[PDB]
Ligand binder design. Structure first.
Ligand SMILES: *[B@@]1([O])O[C]([C]C([O])=O)[C]=[C][C][C]1[N]C(=O)[C]C1=[C][C]=[C]S1
Ligand SMILES: [Cl-]
Length: 260
């Protein structure tokens, strides 16, 4: 709809920030796009690509997810909800992936990054999939600075929607690995006020949120509406003031506009 475009523009205006939306509707292979080719800081939405890279690696190393990783005090960063419970012990790569995806643990993300060879290796994995837009430049916590004009740790809504579709509904990952990614995303604990908040209660959602400087507030989701083909939705939002507050409501509103 041109109506949908007008409503998204209205939402953006009211919000004071910059909104990026990409919806893929697998029912009819249509898209709804708003600033979908602009770059936005991914913040923790990048953790999907890092977990996917480990899942890919596990297809040629079948006991990889059980591999143990030491957690030390020196690993702690700014937000360690799961890793702080495991200091001086080990977590498996499966546990780290779950912590990164479901609690947005930042130590967990740094262990996924390190395992696969660093930010440039996560980026090369994206390229191998056909995503030529995604770039992961830094580790946690600095990858979330979200400075306007800074291309580090950014992607576009279009690219991220196409990539999430490939990862969750397509064939980027083997069936076991794809199912594990989907299960992890469906068990997310951080997204109930974001895309989920703009959809009917009966719909099933797997999502990953992100937040960072400049009031950056993000969510990427695979959605199974009741008796419908699935949708992929990326909603990215960022604001002009360095210390702007979170605006999860804006993502909920965008989700409601594009699925109404
Ligand atoms: B990451 O972006 O994911 C979130 C998800 C959310 O808010 O729903 C929460 C915690 C980990 C992430 N965010 C941050 O680390 C915030 C910042 C880090 C450095 C500067 S701001
Ligand atoms: Cl409802």
């Amino acid at each position: 709809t041109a109506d949908v475009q007008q409503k998204l523009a209205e939402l953006e205006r009211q919000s004071g920030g910059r909104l990026g939306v990409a919806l893929i509707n697998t029912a009819d292979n249509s898209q709804i796009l708003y600033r979908a080719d602009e770059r936005f800081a991914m913040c923790s939405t990048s953790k999907v690509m890092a977990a996917a890279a480990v899942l890919k690696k596990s297809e040629s190393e079948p006991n990889l997810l059980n591999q143990r990783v030491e957690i030390k005090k020196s690993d702690l960063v700014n937000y360690n909800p799961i890793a702080e419970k495991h200091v001086n012990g080990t977590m498996s790569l499966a546990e780290l992936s779950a912590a990164a995806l479901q609690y947005s643990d930042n130590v967990a993300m740094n262990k996924l990054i390190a395992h696969v060879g660093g930010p440039a290796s996560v980026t090369a994995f994206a390229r191998q999939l056909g995503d030529e837009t995604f770039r992961l430049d830094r580790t946690e916590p600095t990858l979330n600075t979200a400075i306007p004009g800074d291309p580090r740790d950014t992607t576009s809504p279009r690219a991220m929607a196409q990539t999430l579709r490939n990862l969750t509904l397509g064939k980027a990952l083997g069936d076991s690995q794809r199912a594990q990614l989907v299960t992890w995303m469906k068990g997310n604990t951080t997204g109930a006020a974001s895309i989920q908040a703009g959809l009917p209660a009966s719909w099933v959602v797997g999502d990953k949120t992100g937040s960072g400087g400049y009031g950056t507030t993000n969510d990427i989701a695979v959605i199974w509406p009741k008796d419908r083909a699935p949708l992929i939705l990326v909603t990215y939002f960022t604001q002009p003031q360095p210390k702007a507050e979170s605006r999860r409501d804006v993502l909920a509103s965008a989700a409601k506009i594009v699925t109404d």
